[PDB]
Paper text:
We thought that proteins with alpha helices at both their N- and C-termini might be fused to generate artificial repeat proteins by connecting the C-terminal helix of the repeating unit to the N-terminal helix of the next repeating unit. To test this design strategy, we used a protein A domain as the repeating module and generated 3-, 4- and 5-module repeat proteins. All these repeat proteins were successfully produced in E. coli and could be crystallized. In the crystal structures, all the repeating units were connected as designed. The twist and bending angles of the fused helices were very similar to those of the ideal helix. Interestingly, the protein A modules in the crystal structures, especially the last ones, exhibited significant structural variation, and close structural analysis demonstrated that this structural diversity was due not to the helix fusion but to the intrinsic flexibility of the protein A module. For this analysis, we downloaded many of the protein A structures deposited in the PDB database and aligned them structurally. The analysis showed that the three helices also varied substantially in orientation and position in wild-type protein A structures; this result implies that crystal packing selects one specific conformation of protein A from a mixture of several available structures.
Numbering used by the authors: 37 to 266
Write the structure that this text describes.
Amino acid sequence: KEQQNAFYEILHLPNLNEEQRNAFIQSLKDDPSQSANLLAEAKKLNEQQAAFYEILSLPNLNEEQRNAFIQSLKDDPSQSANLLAEAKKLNEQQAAFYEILHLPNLNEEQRNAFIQSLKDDPSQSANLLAEAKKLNEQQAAFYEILHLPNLNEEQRNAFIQSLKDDPSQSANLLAEAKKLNEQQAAFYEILHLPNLNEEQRNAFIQSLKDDPSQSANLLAEAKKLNDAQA
């Protein structure tokens, strides 16, 4: 019975070529008593060559690392499991590494120390990248509201205080600030428009100080009137 099982299993080993497969099958033709051996040996070139494929397809390793794993596996065929996992671990460490090293809103202290905590404990890469990205978002937002040109410093340090207290609302505190910014912006450019009479200007100040939701629209209207009354 074992000749049939080993026969089928060798004929359906997915990671061998026809040369290897038919060589093994010819060996089974010579001495069927070597059945449990051949199958074993046979499949131990399977999960070897399969391994050669996977380490060949990990993109965050270099050639030296890859073919170094290939070599270290051709010398120790039975460790293909371990050497693979290790390899598939290293892929993370490097992938995280450069992703941490290419965040444009971190200074050199935060770089060298995130990266140093990566070299020290790679098992936490998944988290060290995460909070890095978070930080790279947060700090970025801090740099945007810090350079919005139409806010008095009370408004700036108010928003900054709010996001410092709660970084989970970052994208909502930024989009708020900009909003106010744009609104106030329009205000300025309405009062510095030369060809309007003070009736339309007072009415615009009132309606704007009521519904900023159409601020942009209002501004546009004003400008067009400014074009017509030149």
